[PDB]
Amino acid sequence: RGSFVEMVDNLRGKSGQGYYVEMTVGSPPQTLNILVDTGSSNFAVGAAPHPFLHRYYQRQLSSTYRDLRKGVYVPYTQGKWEGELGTDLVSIPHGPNVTVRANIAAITESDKFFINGSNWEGILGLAYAEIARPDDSLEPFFDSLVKQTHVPNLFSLQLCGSVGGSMIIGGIDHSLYTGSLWYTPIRREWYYEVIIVRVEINGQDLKMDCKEYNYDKSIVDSGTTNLRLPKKVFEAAVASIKAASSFPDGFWLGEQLVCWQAWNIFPVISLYLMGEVTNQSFRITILPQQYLRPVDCYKFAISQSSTGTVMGAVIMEGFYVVFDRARKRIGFAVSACHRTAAVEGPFVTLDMEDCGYNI
Template sequence: MMRIIYCALLAFILHQALGDEYNLFGDAGQAYSVEVNIGHPPQKFYLLVDTGSTTLAVASHARQGGKSYFKANQSSSIQDSHKQVQAKYSQGMWIGQLATDFVQFPSLANVPAVRSNLALITESHKFFMNGSGWQGLLGLAYLPVGAWGENVVVDSWMDSVDRSLAVPKSFQLKLCGVKSTTNATHYGSFQMIDDQNPNRNSNRSYRTPVLRKRWYEVGVISVRALTDLVPINASLNNTNETIVEVKDFNDEMCLKLNEEKSIVDSGTTNIRLPEIVFGEIVGEIRNAARMTNVLISDEFWYHGEAGCWPEPQMWSLPSIAIDLLSADANDQYFTLEIPAQNYMRVVTASTEVGAISEFCYKLGLEAGSETVLGYTAMEGLEVLFNRSAGWIGWQTSNCGSNARITGPYNASKSLVDTCQLRRPVSETAVSIKAAQWALCGVSIIAGGVLVYLLAPCVKALCKKPIRTQQISLSQTALFEQES
């Protein structure tokens, strides 16, 4: 209960101090959450904003460390499907019941309350963090990575909004990070965008294509530590449109980064990199740290342990450069420059009167089998997700760290070919086709059995060609609609 009171108080303070623009907040390491109302009468919760999954899911039972949960029997508008669904993540999983109810976000004035699929979580494992300020998840990715169950398709809240407004909507995340070095609470903005409206941010926008509409899968060309003060042939002016020829390129790294997949995931904290790339970058940053007067242990760099000091740290370490494939040309890319303020994450900032001050940090990089640009790579930037057109736009922001974007740059060859980013047929299309052919086969078998059992009526039916034509046209229309 104290956690919920704290979240409500924090949201009120942020609203008063920062204005209507900011509607996201979160404790250290817990991503960003937004306030939501579910059901009639509305029940208020906080959902983690997650571009790495699809389903809207909310706790529906009391759990250790969190007493707030959705009470389905108190909503007059709930519709229970009586079907079980589940979802697994890189860390944690849950099982729940699929239902629909009205969902409304008070801070999104341009989006009405819509009836949406939601999963009522009945049991979970390593999903809810102890003392987390959120009670569920708002998935914003595409349908193929939604929750699953037997003979059930779980639509997303975004799909429900598109149907309700009869026009596809984009959304934008402006993640600001912590307000100061003495406060571990971070804040930001989640907004739904009409594609026809002009962009209020005058800074230059850079677009990267979504390679496959499952997660927000992008082409990460390279990740490196900027040990030099100025990137290779780079212009520091975000409005500079000069394209520079860059001849040298690390083909091996590009292949490694995209070997499994590379995704943009606001529900993940760190920047996750393949082991070999992680080792190279951390080695360079660690060497740079040795030149400073701050003593940092190996456990901090390689084992995810926190480093604590009695004073807040002003890090003078290299920025991390993340090169992304440009949507404008196959041989073009641009660079996100992520400062040390982002990846040296504040996890504790204790300045209580009468107590010893302690400021603890964790490294915002980790090793894994795939490449994930977590919110550590997004803070200090405005990131626009255009789901229907299939691209992500990046701009520098007026809040947060001094993150920069440079480019675009030309490579000496096609990055799509060199990094093997082509996908001949999307997995979504393949699965839909397979389902369609399976359904067609089942229909033919069932039709044959039916004709055999109703043999006396077959002759009569054959004398009605119009009825046969209507059935055939109906099956064709269904096939085209699902395609």
């Protein structure tokens, strides 16, 4: 229950290109490297010899593949992916010793989806059915896993910033963190939505209506690199970090990098998250090591958003993060692989419910 040595160090990546896990699809098993994404809900894999791909799902070679005779189209601002739906047998070699029949989108056409020079060929959407495409009737991978096996309904991520990490499927590994886990409620089961109730720069409150910290929504998303903040909050955050570190104007907007010869002028950032108890919150503290990401040239790893707050790899790399789906909560503890990053509580915060934005 608290030890999963087989699953420790099962993630790899390249800086800025996400974290991936080895998976097998079909019979006989086809090995594929798959992007771990808590911000989406489709299991989708390259199914055609796109030039950027080391390998791809060859449906014709699999005796257990079943055609669902249905297309799926996922548009982005940039480009897109498009594919054909089916089911097949799926395993995770460095995961639980089980095999499940899962939905798979065989990607037949894409634009700006596969990265030139990356070592992954698909995406594993770990979020809920509600945001699955084409609709919520397409059961996500993790739902299928839980429905078909005795694997407990939770997973955890230790993202260590080329890069490596651990995805513990069905449990928690206590050697992957120090101190205690602190839990924040999943507000709704679509994205991993949470509520930020207070933001501090260097220990100083931003003094904003907390509703705006979640304007639209706040999510935990392993497929995003940056800490993304709502426009107005980003505005205030930058203005406060700027004043704490008194650099070009375009650097703050992510329009150009800044280079130095091969930290203390930059403040710590505390996010207070809604706790499990009425009027109780806790805080996570991230270092400038987290929001200043090397590409010695660094890209300011905080950016504005029109889709709400996104707690991406920047945040997650400082912490062991538990996606406790059974109890509708997300746990945070100091990573045993990350001034140090901190998770602290309890704090008294009133009117935390008001911080959630409603349609």
